[PDB]
C-alpha cells in the first residue's frame, strides 16, 4: 500500500542566495535551508530545482548547493536532488554525487530547448537511473519547457521500477485525476502552490513549492484541513496564500521570496544574473504584504 | 429565483435534414429535470448544437424547452451569436417566454477589442432588460477575459455572473474572491469536484443529461466535506466523460438517452452520427455505471 | 466556358447603417471602386472582410446580388458561403450558383472541435448540393483550424475542390502545397506578405486592403514575377505601412473611411464592431496624403 | 574587420559514444562547409552544434578546433549564449581572444525573464567581451518573442550589430528590415531562404547548408538577380531535402550525409539518438536523387 510513498510530504523548493558575481553565499544558503525545516516546519527540501536558479549554475556551484543543503539539515529530513540538465553527462555526474551524499531520491526536469522525441526523453531518464541506481522523480513543467507528457507516456515511464513518481505542475486537473487513478502506486507531488487545495482533494501525496519557504505553515494547514474534510477553511487559507503568491509573482518571485527571508534576518543576498535584484519601487507593497500576513 | 444549482446543457435531437425533432426534444428536456433531478436547463448552448442552427430553430428550441418543464425549473437562455441583431431578437423572445436569465458566449472568430466585447453584452442587456450570464469558453473561442475585464463586466448590475470553463483554477480562485456576490457556474464536467471546493454556486454541463445524479452527489458531498467520496465519484464520472469525448460527445450522449427509450435522433451535420464501431464500448459503459 | 480564376481580388467590404442593415447603394460603389478604380480581376464576396459572419441569411443574399449586379460580365466572382449552418451554407451556395458566381468558397468549420472527416464532408456536401467549384478558405488564425498536406491532398483529390484561399503564415507549408498541387489554385490572403507569396508561386491573391491599394498590389505581383524584386519589395514596404496603419485603427472601419474620402457612401461597420475613432483621423489623413489613397 | 554578409554553416559536431568531441571529425565538417559547400563562414556552438548539451570545456574545444580548421578569409561567429551568464561571458572572452569576428547569443530561456533582464544579459556580455554581438532569436525553441520595439531598444546599442532571425513571420521580418536598414539580418530558416532573400536579408545561417550550401547560394544569387522562378525551383528541391532530414532527426541525418563523403561523422550527443537504420534506404535515395 505505502509502496513508493516514502517521500510523501511538503517540500520547500530551496532558494539560493548569491553575491554580486553570481557566486553562492554558503552561510545564507545554510540559513534558508534551516528556515524551511525549523521555521516553516516542512518535511524536506527539493534542491537545485527551478526555484534555486539551478539552471543558471555551473556544475561546481550545483554540487556546492547539494553539499550545503544536506549539511544544514538533520537526518529525519527528506531530501530530493534535482539533477536534470541538458548535459546528460553532467546530470549523471550530479546524480552519482547527490546519491553518494545520501539524498533519498533524484529528480530531473524533462529535456527542453531541443524538440526531443519521446523515446529520447524516456531514455534520458533511463540513462540517469542506470548509472546512479537511485530512485527518480519526473519533473514535469510544461509551462517552462513546452514539453507535454500524455497518460500513455507516464505509463511507459512509470513502468520502470525506479521511476517512483512525478513532481506535477501541469495546470490540468482532468489530466491529474486520470494520472492519479491510472497510477495509484506512484508518488505525485504537486508543483503549483496557488492550486494546493485543488491538488490535495485530487489525492496528491504532497507538494513541492517556491512559496513554502515563506508560507509552509499555511500550506500545511491547507493540505491537512482538506484531507480532513474541512474544505471551507482550507479554501480560505488558499485565498490568503494566493494573495501572497500573486503579489510575489508580480514583483519577481525568487528575489521577492528572498527579500521576505532577509526581513527575518537571513543573509538572502542577491539573485544570479540575468535575474534582476528586487526592485525598490515594490518595497512598500512588499512590507504591507508582510505585516498583513505576518511573514 | 436565485440561479444556484445544477443545469443540463440541453442537447437537441435532429432528423436527417438537420431539423429539430420537437417530440424527442421534449423528452430530452424532461429527462434532465425528472430522471437526472437537475435544477434547470441551459438552452441553446454549445451542447445543443446551437451554433449550427438558424434563428427560427433557435426560437423553436427555446419554446419547446420552456413548454416541456415545470414552472419552477430554472431556465437560462444562451442567446449569444456573432449577429448582434439576432442575439437581441433571441434575447427578447426568450425573455418574453419567461427565461430567468440570458447568457451569451464572448463574441468570437473576429479579433474584437475588449471594448467591443463589452458593449455587445451591454447592448444585449439594454434591449432586453433581463439579467445576463457571461459564457466564457476560451478553448472554443480563443477569447480570454482577465480579472480586470471581469471587474468591468461585473460592475454592471445586470451581469449577475459567469458560466466559467477556462481550465485555470488560480484565476477561478481570484474571481471567486473578487466577486463574492456574483453567480459562478462551472462548465467543465470533468473538473466539478475541483470547481466545488473552489466555491462555484453550481454547474452547467452536457454530461449531466446522462449523469446528473452522480454530479449532484459530487457537488453535495464535496460541500458537506465528504471529499474522498466526492473524488471517487469524479473518478467514475471521468471514465464516462473520457469515453464519450473519445466517441464524439453530443451524439454519444444522445445514444445513451436513446437507450432509455428517448427519441434522441441525430446530430446536425457537419457532425457525424454515432459510429457503430463504438457501440460495444458504449454498452459496456452504460452497463458498468447503470446509465 | 469557364473563367481562369487566376488573378487579384478585392475581399469586398460592406457598408451598413446605424441598425446593421446593408447600405445597398454604397455597397454598389464599393464593388465598382474595386473593379473600375483599383483595376482588380474580381470580387471575393461575403468573406471575413465583408463582416459576413455578422450577417443573417437574407443579408448575405442581398450582398451576393448587389455585388453581382454591380460589375461587368468579365469580372471574376467568388462566393464565400462557409457557415456553421450547413443547410444555410447550401442554400447560399445554390443562390450564388444561380446568380452565376464562378466558384464557391467556404471557411473551414470552426468553434466546435470538428473532426477532419467532418470538415471534409461539409465541403463534399456543399459541392454535392450545388455542383459548383469549391475554394477551401484556410484562416487558421481566426479559426484555430489547421490543415496538413495529407489533409490538403485528400481535399484536393476532389476534382471540384479547385483550390485554396491561403492565409496561414507558414511559407514552408505553402511551398509544399505549391509543389504537391500544381494543378490547383492557390490564392494568398495575407496582403502584408504578397511579395513573398508571389515569389512562392501563388496564382493571385484575395485581400481586404486591395480595396484601397489595388494598383500597388498589382505592381508588386507583376514586378515580383518579372524579377524586378527590389522595386516589388519597396512597394511591399509602402504597402505594409498602409496595412499596419489600418490594422492599428480597426481595419474594416478604417478601410471604409478611406473609401469614404473618394466620395463613396461607406456607412458604418456592423456592431459589435465599433465605428472608426475620430482620434485616429489626423494620422489616417497623413497616410492618405502620403500614399495618395 | 569583415562585413558579415553571406552564407554560414551552423557547424555540426561529431561525438563518440561517451558524448565527447571527435576533433578529427569536427575539422572535416568545418572544411567541408568551407571547401565543398563554398560558404563564407561558420556559426559555431549554435543549436545545430548540439551546443546546449555541452559542458564549458567542450564548447571551448569546439571554438578552438573550428578556428584552427579554417583560413582567415573565413568569417566566424561564436554563439556563446547560455543560461549561465558567467559562463557566457567566459566563452565570449575565449572566442574573442581566438579571433572570432562577432559573438552571438540565444535569448535567455527556460525562466520567464522580463525584457529588461533579456536586454541586460546582452549588454553585460558586450561590456565584458567588447566584441560585436548578434542576437539569436528562435521563438520556436525558446518561447521568447522579440517585438519591433524591443529590437529597436536592443539595436540602439552600437555593439549589437544584427540578428540571426528564425521567427517564421514575414510581416515582422519586413518591418525589421525597414526599421533597421543599418543592421545585419541573417535568416535562420533554411526552408524559407528564398522568401527571406527577396525580403532583403544580408545572408543566412543554416544546418542544411553543411550538405546543400552550393544549392543555397544559387537560391540567394538567383533571387537577387531576379531569376525568381529558378531560385524557387531550387527551393523546391532544397525543401525535399529539408523535410526528409527533419523526419529522420535533422542533426544525426545531416551528419550521415557527411559520412557518405568520407567524413568521420561519429554520433550525436545523448539524449539525442543515433540515426535509425530503418531510414537508411530512404536517405540513400535522397543522397542519390539530389546528388549529396
Numbering used by the authors:
A (entry chain B): -1 to 293
B (entry chain D): 3 to 293
C (entry chain A): 1 to 293
D (entry chain C): 2 to 293
Question: What text does the study give?
Answer:
The effect of Schiff base formation in the S. aureus enzyme is also similar to that found with the E. coli enzyme, namely that it causes ordering of the loop region (138–146) which is not resolved in apo structures. This results in a repositioning of Tyr137, a residue noted as being involved in substrate stabilisation and/or catalysis.
NAL catalyses the reversible aldol condensation of N-acetylmannosamine with pyruvate to yield the sialic acid, N-acetylneuraminic acid (Neu5Ac). NAL is a class I aldolase, functioning through the formation of an enzyme–pyruvate Schiff base formed with Lys165 which carries out a nucleophilic attack on the aldehyde carbon of the open-chain form of the N-acetylmannosamine. Here, using the NAL from Staphylococcus aureus, we demonstrate quantitative conversion of a cysteine residue, site-specifically into the nonproteogenic amino acid γ-thialysine, chosen as a mimic of the natural catalytic lysine residue at position 165, using the double alkylation-elimination method and that high yields of an active, modified NAL can be purified. We then characterise the resulting enzyme activity, analyse the pH-dependency of catalysis and use X-ray crystallography to investigate the structural basis of the changes brought about by modifying the enzyme.
